[PDB]
Amino acid sequence: GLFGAIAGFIENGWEGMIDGWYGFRHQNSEGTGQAADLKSTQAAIDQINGKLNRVIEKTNEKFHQIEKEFSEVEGRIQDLEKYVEDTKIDLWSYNAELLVALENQHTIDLTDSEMNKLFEKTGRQLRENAEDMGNGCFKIYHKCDNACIESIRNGTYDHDVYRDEALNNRF
Amino acid sequence: GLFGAIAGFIENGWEGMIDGWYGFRHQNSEGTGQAADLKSTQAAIDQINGKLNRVIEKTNEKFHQIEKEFSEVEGRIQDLEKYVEDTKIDLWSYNAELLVALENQHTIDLTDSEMNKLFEKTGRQLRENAEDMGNGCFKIYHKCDNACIESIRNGTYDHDVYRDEALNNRF
Amino acid sequence: GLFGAIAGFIENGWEGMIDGWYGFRHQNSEGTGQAADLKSTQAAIDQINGKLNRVIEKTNEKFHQIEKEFSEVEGRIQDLEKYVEDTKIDLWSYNAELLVALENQHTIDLTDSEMNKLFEKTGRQLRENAEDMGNGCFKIYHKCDNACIESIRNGTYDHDVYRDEALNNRFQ
Amino acid sequence: PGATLCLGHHAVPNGTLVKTITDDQIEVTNATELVQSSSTGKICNNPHRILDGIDCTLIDALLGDPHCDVFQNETWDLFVERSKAFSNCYPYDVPDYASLRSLVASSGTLEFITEGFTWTGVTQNGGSNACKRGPGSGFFSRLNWLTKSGSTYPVLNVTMPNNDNFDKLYIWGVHHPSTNQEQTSLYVQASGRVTVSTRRSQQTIIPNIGSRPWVRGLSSRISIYWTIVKPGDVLVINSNGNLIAPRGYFKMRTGKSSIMRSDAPIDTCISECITPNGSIPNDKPFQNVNKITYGACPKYVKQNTLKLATGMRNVPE
Amino acid sequence: PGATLCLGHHAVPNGTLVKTITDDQIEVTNATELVQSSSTGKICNNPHRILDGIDCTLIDALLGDPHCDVFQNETWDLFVERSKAFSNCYPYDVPDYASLRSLVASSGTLEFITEGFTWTGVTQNGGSNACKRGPGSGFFSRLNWLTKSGSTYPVLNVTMPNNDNFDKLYIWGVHHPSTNQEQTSLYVQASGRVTVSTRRSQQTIIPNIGSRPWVRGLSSRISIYWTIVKPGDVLVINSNGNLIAPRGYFKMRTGKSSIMRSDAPIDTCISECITPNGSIPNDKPFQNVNKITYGACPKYVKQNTLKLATGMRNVPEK
Amino acid sequence: PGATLCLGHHAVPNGTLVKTITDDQIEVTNATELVQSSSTGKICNNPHRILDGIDCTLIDALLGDPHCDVFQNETWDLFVERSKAFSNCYPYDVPDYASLRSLVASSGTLEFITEGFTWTGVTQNGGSNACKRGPGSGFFSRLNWLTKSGSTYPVLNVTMPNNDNFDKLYIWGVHHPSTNQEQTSLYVQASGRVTVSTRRSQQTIIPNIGSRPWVRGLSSRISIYWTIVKPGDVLVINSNGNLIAPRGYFKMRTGKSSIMRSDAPIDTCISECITPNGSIPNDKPFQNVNKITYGACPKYVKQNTLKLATGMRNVPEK
Ligand SMILES: *[C@@H]1O[C@H](CO)[C@@H](O[C@@H]2O[C@H](CO)[C@@H](O[C@@H]3O[C@H](CO[C@H]4O[C@H](CO)[C@@H](O)[C@H](O)[C@@H]4O)[C@@H](O)[C@H](O)[C@@H]3O)[C@H](O)[C@H]2NC(C)=O)[C@H](O)[C@H]1NC(C)=O
Ligand SMILES: *[C@@H]1O[C@H](CO)[C@@H](O[C@@H]2O[C@H](CO)[C@@H](O[C@@H]3O[C@H](CO)[C@@H](O)[C@H](O)[C@@H]3O)[C@H](O)[C@H]2NC(C)=O)[C@H](O)[C@H]1NC(C)=O
Ligand SMILES: CCOC(=O)c1c(CSc2ccccc2)n(C)c2cc(Br)c(O)c(CN(C)C)c12
Ligand SMILES: CCOC(=O)c1c(CSc2ccccc2)n(C)c2cc(Br)c(O)c(CN(C)C)c12
Ligand SMILES: CCOC(=O)c1c(CSc2ccccc2)n(C)c2cc(Br)c(O)c(CN(C)C)c12
Ligand SMILES: *[C@@H]1O[C@H](CO)[C@@H](O[C@@H]2O[C@H](CO)[C@@H](O)[C@H](O)[C@H]2NC(C)=O)[C@H](O)[C@H]1NC(C)=O
Ligand SMILES: *[C@@H]1O[C@H](CO)[C@@H](O[C@@H]2O[C@H](CO)[C@@H](O)[C@H](O)[C@H]2NC(C)=O)[C@H](O)[C@H]1NC(C)=O
Ligand SMILES: *[C@@H]1O[C@H](CO)[C@@H](O[C@@H]2O[C@H](CO)[C@@H](O)[C@H](O)[C@H]2NC(C)=O)[C@H](O)[C@H]1NC(C)=O
Ligand SMILES: *[C@@H]1O[C@H](CO)[C@@H](O[C@@H]2O[C@H](CO)[C@@H](O)[C@H](O)[C@H]2NC(C)=O)[C@H](O)[C@H]1NC(C)=O
Ligand SMILES: *[C@@H]1O[C@H](CO)[C@@H](O[C@@H]2O[C@H](CO)[C@@H](O)[C@H](O)[C@H]2NC(C)=O)[C@H](O)[C@H]1NC(C)=O
Ligand SMILES: *[C@@H]1O[C@H](CO)[C@@H](O[C@@H]2O[C@H](CO)[C@@H](O)[C@H](O)[C@H]2NC(C)=O)[C@H](O)[C@H]1NC(C)=O
Ligand SMILES: *[C@@H]1O[C@H](CO)[C@@H](O)[C@H](O)[C@H]1NC(C)=O
Ligand SMILES: *[C@@H]1O[C@H](CO)[C@@H](O)[C@H](O)[C@H]1NC(C)=O
Ligand SMILES: *[C@@H]1O[C@H](CO)[C@@H](O)[C@H](O)[C@H]1NC(C)=O
Ligand SMILES: *[C@@H]1O[C@H](CO)[C@@H](O)[C@H](O)[C@H]1NC(C)=O
Ligand SMILES: *[C@@H]1O[C@H](CO)[C@@H](O)[C@H](O)[C@H]1NC(C)=O
Ligand SMILES: *[C@@H]1O[C@H](CO)[C@@H](O)[C@H](O)[C@H]1NC(C)=O
Ligand SMILES: *[C@@H]1O[C@H](CO)[C@@H](O)[C@H](O)[C@H]1NC(C)=O
């Protein structure tokens, strides 16, 4: 993808992440844990539902069509009826192929981008208290129990509380 | 947007920025201020004008047309004249809907990208003299009078001049 | 470009890089050097070959089509034959113009993206042992001979080996 | 002394292959099909008014072939013609059959109004054993085979004005006997003539004597013509032999009605989109069942599948 | 003992809703309209040569219906047909009327060249009170109603070669009497025939006798046919009755001329694009006024509006 | 004591200009062309079966104009008609010529099967010095000019059923003599009649006597008609004068055959795509050579060039 996260610095996805599209896994003094991130999940889901709703909007109704199968040879007028219909089908087949190609490229890029956005957001929340290990994981340089992790996941982590302990362990 | 700045880590736009599209607000010892960034603004305006000029480029001129209204029922070849014109109108209506959808998606993504580019550029000028606060703002860890702020805005800030003072306040 | 690397924080390209699309230039104690990065080069090339092969996928094949040049004035039926053909040619010309415009915009964006991706992967390999100088170059704060540089380029540089020396040079 | 916080995304064991701008095949977690490629095999009778022609073509129901007179005054959204349909009346041809079939189908109704034509000097209601109506010989219910009265066939010259506010459709015909004796024996004249005119249009037909292949016992033929009379215009029929006269007009309507050829059974269900293969759902934007459709329908494409990704790239390892 | 430097972008209290691939409606700071949906209601008389066929259709001006005589030798880029037009000459029909109307409209000129046809043995210049020219009887100005002379109507057999370097358009006709009495009184033969041919093509018409509805006093009719003769070819007319003869040819051109039905008045202004609703500007790429157009015009679409974003996403609040 | 590591990308002194959504001209390192705009000027004789008609049109080979009889029973994927083709037999016309030429071209074969028609009471095998076959007079090889035998021309009434499982194409004609003397001297009746019928179709032609432009010695004409007989149907021919009879049927096929007008010489080479200008390669997706094509061909567009970028933006200087 354009953003280098999915199938990039994130090595692989998580078949065990069942309750979200993106999320957090941690290991600390009390053990290991996992949680879906609902905002980034819902941002991807809303965008894909948007694209999916636009695709099935105005694709419909016609009543009088010309004849399209013929039981007798006739020459000129039948030749033009057939050429108009083959021309039309070729143009719509091309439209359908290109539409799905562009939509699919865009879906892969926007979901890659939401993964990257969540990573950057988390890194900004940790402010000198953590380092990017280069694989989508942060090494957190202070004691960080389940409540501390949960404060990171729910956006209320106060980096100043731990800055001194963390700077001391980093340097 | 794909880049996560506009309507992303930047909470909202500034109705008070009236002389540019992007820019800087600061707080220092001498007070608070606002200034537009000209280069980012002009980059976005030039791309949008470019796309607008391509859309209104070579359209138009005739070549002979068939009849499109009919005052008497005629059967087979009038049915074909109407089917040809309905098919053409439907294909052009589709082209126009998709052209505007793709173009608009791209204008939103490129303007978001210019915001993010200006943010990354400013962060790169500060070199350990600042920390990213997560909302589009830099905490600058040294005394930065108006001339120093303006040196950031015009790309002439020398980080070594302030590195020792800043490193001391950060750590 | 959307990603701000090519024609961005990387000021210009290297006419001297002749064996790759992306790569590294270094200065260390043993001198200066240049080396192409193969993974990023091949990633961009594979993507462009991919779109080129999709575009050149099997082309139309019709045998009997209508007549399209005429030797006599005839009126209504011939007017409709000509209008059908002018309409088709306009619609395909529009498709071809839009096809290459979109493809070209995207080719420029993915090559710009591969550049930015390579820069970020390198920065993540260096872990407090280097600082981003803002022009696509990293200042490395320890002695890094040719084998060390090579270990960065082939993805096996161990930042812990140099962390103490580098932190000591960065902050004191 | 620390902890590790890892960011990630989900994956599934087996995803779906989709196409992109750069890739013929790339695996995503989920996709949805955009091409409708299946049918139940049945035409749903709601919400469109389906008229099953069974043994009858629309033209035979229009003219009034006796085994088709069940369709008198019927209306339809979609008339369905079966391949088993057959004619069982006087052998006939329609020059520009396809156009007549098309304008009647588009009008959507066989509403017939009988008008009081006066055929002075001719025998009316001619019939044939090729066209039995019950046990006895007969004819199209909407046509009037006029023959000589006694031993003369005068010049017929009748008129019929349209004082209504809609268009009138007159269906009429010309008889082509196969021998000169038949011609004189029916229309005591060696060469017939039928001229049907309004104020702005006219048609004159001269019959042709000669043998054609035998159909239902007969080597003669009837030729079917039509004339539309708009409000304020006049119909004038002028003939000195061979006229197969109209008994009235059909009421012309405009709307969303059409006709389709199909052998698919009709069922009691709901479906907005009909194809000759049966009804199809119209939730997908494209379809591959048939280029012939009726109703609010997905657009026909040559592809039999087109997968739209609805999830991210699937990277299980 | 520090500073804060914040990055940002502008916003406005209310922007414009536009559509994207993902969103039916999303707000941006500014947008531009791509569909032309309004007209002045008037047809501008420059830069195209507009020709108003006030009471005259193009076919009646072609044949020479007397109240259309003002249009002789006229030219146009766009001929405009009014709904108030009427015929006031001999009742007629044109088989494949639309084709003749289209090829004459596309030719762009009614330039007529009178030729010296010799009709030996017949009376020329027949007329009718259905086609009055002044208070007296008359006929189409470009057609020649030939009838019996004395007591004979010979077999006409005339030829007319095209030695020029352009195509010639011949308009001719066949008379359909309402009675056998009429037929023999005008043409002594009891059943006529008109045969018009070039070296590689031919048309033969057989008249039709019978009563039709009265139009301007008449039950008889004329049917109009045309013939194009290319350089080097020749025209041959062969008839033994009922011929409505040509007086010459119309000169054929190729170009950008056409015809439109419209009741919009002509005005003094400049506009490259004409619709039956009036002139429209052609700066936008699409239009919603009429699928019928003439000139360099935006493409017709079903949408009445299409907004292209010309600014960023509008986020005045979180 | 440290080191600098710089990331970068390549560039070239001058690349290729390409178009984008934003930009009319932007420079990339490399691009490939998508519009085929040139031809070798020659039609390649492989892989499609090309049939050069040289001096013969398809219709003249169909009827059997003697100098076109070298084409009897020929088949083609593409019939190529030359502008130098000429007719050299009895002067004729084909109402709906284009349709006959089209259905024959699409059928791809001139396979002709002679059938045993019995023409009781007439002379067969009429000829003309307008249509020499060798030193002597002759006629189209596939048509049979029937005339009076002795002093009568009976009412012909023959039938020919189609018991095969393919469609039969019958080509027939009607003779239009130029004088009443001719009409009676060939056919006893003063006015001929030709009726050709199947179970569900019929057509009757009435000849028309009179002069047409003088062509290869004659002022009379033949008019060509055709009739398809489906399996189970039957052909019935009924005529009392002026019939130009069929000798058999052409066998109807369905397939990929067609016809093209071109003066391009044929060459021995390989190419799937043929235009009237010659063959063109079909590796590029679009072409600008001719809207007329045959085979697997790039789509025709109005642009003579369209460059697809195949490398990154070219930034050799700031
Ligand atoms: C012009 O030529 C035409 C062709 O030669 C003549 O028409 C044929 O004339 C005979 C004599 O009247 C007809 O015979 C009748 O045909 C029916 C149908 O027979 C078919 O069906 C039965 C039952 O299924 C089957 O057993 C037969 O094999 C046939 O397949 C018979 O049933 C009647 O009794 C009677 O014999 C021909 O049918 C008729 N055919 C055609 C195609 O025209 C015509 O009479 C000639 N006209 C003149 C004026 O000479
Ligand atoms: C065959 O029937 C038609 C129609 O029924 C006859 O046409 C009619 O002919 C009469 C007498 O010529 C026309 O009467 C005229 O009416 C006007 C008023 O509009 C009046 O001012 C005149 O003095 C004259 O009496 C009548 O309009 C006309 N009707 C139609 C519909 O055309 C025709 O005469 C009959 N043919 C024969 C040979 O009898
Ligand atoms: C320039 C010609 O483009 C195309 O015609 C198509 C092309 C090439 S253009 C393209 C490039 C990327 C993605 C989609 C289309 N592909 C791949 C098609 C795939 C299918 Br399935 C298809 O029906 C068509 C339509 N043909 C039959 C008219 C195309
Ligand atoms: C899959 C094909 O669907 C479409 O054609 C359209 C579609 C669906 S495809 C699409 C998807 C995203 C963005 C734009 C178009 N929309 C939304 C239309 C909106 C308008 Br207004 C419109 O005129 C059409 C054209 N119809 C009338 C032929 C479409
Ligand atoms: C709304 C109409 O858009 C267009 O038609 C075209 C447009 C404008 S829309 C567009 C925008 C970006 C990229 C490509 C097309 N351009 C630039 C064309 C360039 C060429 Br070359 C061309 O043949 C056409 C097709 N014309 C002949 C029908 C267009
Ligand atoms: C974010 O998570 C933290 C940690 O779980 C929440 O803070 C604690 O919440 C629990 C349960 O409500 C209390 O028992 C603790 O006393 C809280 N600790 C502190 C320091 O407040 C916090 O409420 C969460 N915030 C949001 C917005 O969900
Ligand atoms: C794969 O994607 C499809 C489409 O987004 C999902 O199908 C939808 O399912 C919901 C609830 O199950 C329905 O309300 C929608 O109407 C469905 N849409 C369509 C187009 O069918 C499907 O659930 C997804 N599958 C997985 C495993 O996530
Ligand atoms: C067939 O339908 C037509 C039109 O619906 C019938 O004619 C109408 O009959 C109704 C009721 O008898 C009258 O109120 C209308 O005035 C008639 N219309 C006209 C134009 O006269 C006709 O009677 C129907 N025939 C049958 C057998 O049902
Ligand atoms: C729908 O019906 C059509 C017509 O019966 C089918 O198309 C035919 O399919 C057969 C079998 O593959 C082919 O031999 C014919 O050439 C096809 N004819 C045409 C005109 O396409 C079609 O396959 C049916 N589809 C479904 C889903 O029932
Ligand atoms: C331009 O003129 C056309 C034709 O008069 C208008 O289209 C008609 O609009 C009325 C009322 O909306 C409908 O009843 C007709 O059915 C329409 N006709 C057609 C052929 O669509 C059109 O509205 C006019 N447009 C403008 C902008 O004035
Ligand atoms: C292929 O042949 C066609 C037809 O001979 C050429 O088109 C003609 O080109 C000349 C000069 O460019 C024009 O004056 C004619 O009006 C064109 N005719 C038509 C019907 O368009 C075409 O240029 C040739 N192409 C090549 C590559 O040789
Ligand atoms: C940048 O701003 C400083 C003021 O802080 C000024 O002295 C300097 O000249 C400016 N440089 C440019 C290139 O504008
Ligand atoms: C990477 O480079 C180092 C130093 O040159 C070398 O020792 C090592 O084997 C290389 N590893 C790979 C995988 O190429
Ligand atoms: C909106 O965009 C158009 C086109 O670029 C421009 O002319 C107009 O001034 C803009 N409006 C505002 C309020 O900026
Ligand atoms: C029409 O033009 C021709 C030639 O240009 C001329 O001879 C003729 O007199 C003109 N007729 C009128 C009525 O001006
Ligand atoms: C390449 O050459 C063109 C002239 O065709 C010139 O306009 C362009 O600026 C050149 N590019 C560079 C990078 O010098
Ligand atoms: C330019 O691109 C084409 C198509 O990929 C390739 O064959 C060619 O080698 C490229 N040219 C250069 C100089 O790389
Ligand atoms: C022409 O072909 C048909 C069948 O293809 C054959 O029956 C006939 O005899 C052939 N004629 C000649 C002269 O080869």
Swiss-Prot record, chains A, B:
Glycosylation sites: N154
Superkingdom of source: Viruses
Disulfide bonds: C144-C148
Name of the protein this chain belongs to: Hemagglutinin HA2 chain
Organism in which the protein naturally occurs: Influenza A virus (strain A/Northern Territory/60/1968 H3N2)
Lineage: Viruses, Riboviria, Orthornavirae, Negarnaviricota, Polyploviricotina
Gene that specifies this protein: HA
Shown part of the complete sequence: 346 to 516 of 566
Curated annotation (Swiss-Prot), chains E, F:
Positions in the Extracellular compartment: 3-318
Disulphide bonds in the chain: C44-C269, C56-C68, C89-C131, C273-C297
Origin: domain of life: Viruses
Residue positions with a glycan: N14, N30, N73, N157, N277
Official protein name in the record: Hemagglutinin HA1 chain
Gene designation per UniProt: HA
